[PDB]
């Protein structure tokens, strides 16, 4: 490569794996979004919350792919596994599955940062710090806040709580 | 007729029957709308939901009547039967009766489309596709979404659920 | 299902398969787009042409998923296979692979239309006519036009032709 | 020094050397810019490309000098060596010399970052990450893209390719 400098094969490979993890996450959120649009689920604010995350995770994958080319690495795509579930349960089940998914993406980012640190690759380390690590902390804090509110609302009338959370906390229209 | 071309007597008759079905549906929705405006029912958002459908079904009848004249058929009006009920129960009873009514209109549209297909009448088939079939799918999906939300809200406090659905889902002012 | 009417299990299944075909096509175009952004390929107009198609095919999948829910079918996601190639050759190789891909999507749309016709499902038939069949004819005509222009430009100076096509026909900036 | 804190003599010296490297690079680009403005070379877009880099490298030197004073180090200027060539050959020769020059600046930045990491100087490390490392990756990717396009255009008509690259890729007016 005419441009590649200080870019390890180990980072190049890990970036291709992280692209696969982000695209899998996007696909998971696409499935969650359409599940909440079902006529027998019908929680618009929950649908919009997950559809937006599907778009955001796709954008993350595209930013990693642009950076791979900027550093002179080569994008390599793999099979994308289907989401872990076909039906996602309650808003609470779905938000618990989301925070697990985000913790797994966050650990993949921290692992890649640690590899870049070990490889003395400060451009890679800056890149994750600037575009991913704080977006992930912010998102996990928001999901933690939502879990608390959902849990408060279950009480002895789960249906009423699920409706009120979607109407008064999540964005709809 | 100076203009009639490729327009069967069977379609002409079925169009006059469908006009009667749309006007009956409008009359049903007029009755539902004023029932929810009663001082002892008093659910404004439910009143507005049904009053709007009464106007929309009337407009459907008028579009069929305009098309009948465009094709050189002859409008023929019949007695309009009164709605099936004088009092419509809860929001849930009313929304269940509406989705039954819409399924019956949808089947009448599909039956007429099938007659036009059999008669090789593509103008009739286009007309239903363009102005009725998707409006009906969209409306039945919305009523299905509302039924799910109403059902979630019944819990052990039916009155509270009926008020919250009308205040937080349906349009009022 | 509370809303499902005149929607066959055969169409529901074929719609889920077509969603998989559109998402595979999006993934293929994502791979083509980033290949042309490589520093050793560096054809910006070709990159932008394929990146846009990746977005358009994703939007097609999302429209099919919305329609599946409108009809009361159930979205079911499968594993997404990786693209057929890791490296895509010349602009000409890439545009030949694209038109093959589009012909396969077009045949899948025509097959689904034929199934809906056989099932007397005019809403499905309208839906494909209105949002997919002409978009596909328009795209295949544009790719055919581009193939002719690329082929004219190969001459005895392939590099010069590939540069001029990307600079004077495709959109860049 | 009244302000100096956590700023090693090793970093202070390396910053003064890097200022010399940036000013030498500016001087090199000044020479490349005026060579392409010669009446017997006359490639305006190539002239403008290098004149702009001369200004950008000067600005890099000035940012390092401002930071040296912010940290309480002392600017020390050395003799500036003349550029390596008086005449720069073809656009291709010039762009190959530029990417070599940029790789040498990039390695000097990475070396200084590594020194700051070893000295536990996070302000220095942030400073390079924020203002230099990604500017350098972006520039080397752009020069790699240009090299590919120039190389594609040499064919058997080098003059025609050199003119078309300057007219259709580089900015002129
Ligand atoms: Cl799997
Ligand atoms: Cl009667
Ligand atoms: Cl495969
Ligand atoms: Cl010298």
Q: Is C160 on the interface with D (CB under 8 A)?
A: yes
Would you say D31 and D51 are in contact if contact means Cβ atoms under 8 Å apart? no
Q: Which of B144, B145, B147, B151 to probe the C interface (max C CBs under 10 A)? A: B144
Cα separation values, B5 from B74, B127, C153, Å: 14, 16, 53
- CA–CA distance, B51 with B92 (Å, rounded to integer): 17
Instruction: Please judge whether B153 and A162 are an interchain contact, meaning their C-beta atoms are less than 8 angstroms apart.
Output: no
Contacts of A64 (CB under 8 A, 6+ apart): A15, A18, A19, A22
Residue C15 distance to chain A (closest CA, Å) = 14
Task: Please name the chains neighbouring A, where neighbouring means 3+ C-beta pairs under 8 angstroms.
Answer: B, C, D
Question: Which of D141, D147, D153 lies nearest to residue C159, judging by beta carbons?
Answer: D153
Way the structure was solved: X-ray
- Searching chain A, which residue's CA lies closest to the CA of residue B161? A160
Q: Which of C4, C123, C131 to probe the B interface (max B CBs under 10 A)? A: C123
Residue C133 distance to chain A (closest CA, Å) = 24
Instruction: Please judge whether A157 and B152 are an interchain contact, meaning their C-beta atoms are less than 8 angstroms apart.
Output: no
Burial of C85 (0-12, 13-18, 19+ CB in 10 A): middle
Would you say B48 and B170 are in contact if contact means Cβ atoms under 8 Å apart? yes
Contacts of B100 (CB under 8 A, 6+ apart): none
Q: What is the 3-state secondary structure (H, E, C) of A103-131?
A: HHHHHHHHHHHHHHHHCCCHHHHHHHHHH
Question: Which of C31, C39, C68 lies nearest to residue A77, judging by beta carbons?
Answer: C31
Contacts of A28 (CB under 8 A, 6+ apart): A54, A83, A84, A101
**Phi, then psi, of C35 in degrees rounded to 5:** -60, -45
Cα separation values, A134 from A110, A120, C154, Å: 11, 21, 49
- CA–CA distance, D105 with C74 (Å, rounded to integer): 57
Would you say D78 and D24 are in contact if contact means Cβ atoms under 8 Å apart? no
| Maximum distance among all Cα pairs of chain C, rounded to whole angstroms | 65
Deposited resolution, Å: 1.5
DSSP lists the bridge partners of residue A69 as none
Q: What is the distance between the terminal CA atoms of chain A, rounded to a whole angstrom? A: 50
Q: Which ligand is nearest to the CA of D79?
A: 4
| D60 closest CA partner among D97, D25, D90, D86 | D25
Instruction: Please judge whether B141 and C6 are an interchain contact, meaning their C-beta atoms are less than 8 angstroms apart.
Output: no
| Pair of tokens at residue B49 | 């939901």
Q: Which ligand is nearest to the CA of C79?
A: 1
Cα separation values, D87 from D29, D36, D94, D153, D163, Å: 12, 9, 9, 22, 19
Residue entry with tokens 């550093």: A71
Q: Strand (E) positions, A30-93?
A: none
């Amino acid at each position: 490569s005419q441009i590649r400098q200080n870019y390890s094969t180990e980072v190049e490979a890990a970036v291709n794996r992280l692209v696969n993890l982000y695209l899998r996450a996007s696909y998971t959120y696409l499935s969650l979004g359409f599940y909440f649009d079902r006529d027998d689920v019908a929680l618009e604010g929950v649908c919009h919350f997950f559809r937006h995350l599907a778009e955001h995770k796709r954008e993350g994958a595209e930013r990693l792919l642009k950076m791979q080319n900027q550093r002179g690495g080569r994008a390599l795509f793999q099979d994308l596994q289907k989401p872990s579930q076909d039906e996602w349960g309650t808003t609470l089940d779905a938000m618990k599955a989301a925070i697990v998914l985000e913790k797994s993406l966050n650990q993949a980012l921290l692992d890649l940062h640690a590899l870049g640190s070990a490889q003395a690759d400060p451009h890679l380390c800056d890149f994750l710090e600037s575009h991913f690590l704080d977006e992930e902390v912010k998102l996990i804090k928001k999901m933690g806040d939502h879990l608390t509110n959902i849990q408060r609302l279950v009480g002895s009338q789960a249906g009423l709580g699920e409706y009120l959370f979607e109407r008064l906390t999540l964005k709809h229209d």
